[PDB]
């Protein structure tokens, strides 16, 4: 998809999440993998899950990294 749209969906979905300040979505936005809005949606959802599974109310970079790896094959 278009690069700006990819960013928009990420920022739109996470706008309603508690991300630690150091997280930078551009890290995933900037990747070559051709993912879909659904994948982006899954990545964010898994990330929240991973944060909760650690009794953490703030989402971390490690969460998005696993989630990304988990959704893209």
């Amino acid at each position: 998809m278009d690069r700006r749209q990819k960013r928009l969906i990420f920022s739109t979905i996470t706008s309603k999440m508690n991300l630690s300040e150091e997280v930078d979505l551009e890290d995933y936005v900037a990747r070559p993998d051709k993912i879909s809005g659904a994948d982006i949606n899954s990545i964010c959802q898994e990330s929240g899950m991973l944060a909760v599974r650690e009794n953490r109310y703030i989402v971390l970079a490690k969460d998005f990294e696993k989630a990304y790896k988990t959704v893209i094959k």
Partner: protein
């Protein structure tokens, strides 16, 4: 709470007094690690509690340990925009070119989030302007992509290259064009960004540009080469 270790939670929450009483009551707590391989330093950095960071530093705690995500205190501080803490870390010898799990250095995040002062602090401290992450992306790619024009300028002052290619074959100019960062693009060509490099899609920054931006750039380039 953000951690399974009490001291880490107090660091994030910024409870300086209680944090000091507990560490002085048991010095080991100053470097105890949590489930994310983080210590009070990481969390204090994330939250931006300068005081707690200074207390920990004068205590002599290590300043370069990375969490399980490869992030060091400097990465966190830089990305979170904690100017004061980034300066203090540098003083204590924070590794300016350390990379995390995806290959990024603090400069990557500083340029990405358009953090001028933190960027400058990092570059003045020996950061490599051309540091490439696991996707061969540099600080300039992230800046050019989002239109961080002033950031790009800052990177240039510190001898940053304009033609490094990422894993998709794109140069900061490509990204700039794709996202229609008009002013940025013209500026880039103005400083030597090549309009001839092809990406993995066999496109040049010209063929990626839209709305007749390519004509403009080709004219700027040819005139800059004359």
């Amino acid at each position: 709470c953000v951690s399974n270790i009490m001291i880490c939670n107090l660091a994030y929450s910024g409870k300086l007094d209680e944090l000091k009483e507990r560490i002085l009551a048991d010095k080991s707590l100053a470097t105890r690690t949590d489930q994310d391989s983080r210590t009070a330093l990481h969390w204090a950095c994330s939250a931006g509690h300068t005081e707690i960071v200074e207390f920990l530093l004068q205590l002599g705690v290590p300043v370069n340990d990375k969490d399980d995500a490869g992030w060091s205190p400097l990465h966190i501080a830089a990305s979170a925009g904690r100017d004061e803490i980034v300066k203090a870390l540098l003083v204590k010898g924070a590794h300016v070119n350390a990379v995390n799990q995806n290959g990024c250095t603090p400069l990557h995040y500083a340029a990405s989030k358009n953090r001028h002062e933190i960027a400058v602090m990092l570059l003045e401290g020996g950061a490599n302007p051309d540091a490439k992450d696991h996707y061969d992306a540099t600080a300039m790619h992230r800046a050019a992509a989002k239109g961080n024009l002033k950031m790009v300028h800052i990177l240039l002052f510190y001898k940053a290259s304009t033609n490094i290619q990422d894993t998709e074959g794109n140069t900061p100019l490509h990204l700039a064009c794709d996202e229609e960062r008009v002013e940025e693009a013209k500026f880039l060509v103005t400083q030597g960004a090549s309009i001839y490099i092809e990406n993995k899609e066999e496109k040049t920054p010209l063929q990626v540009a839209k709305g007749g931006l390519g004509l403009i750039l080709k004219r700027l380039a040819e005139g800059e080469e004359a």
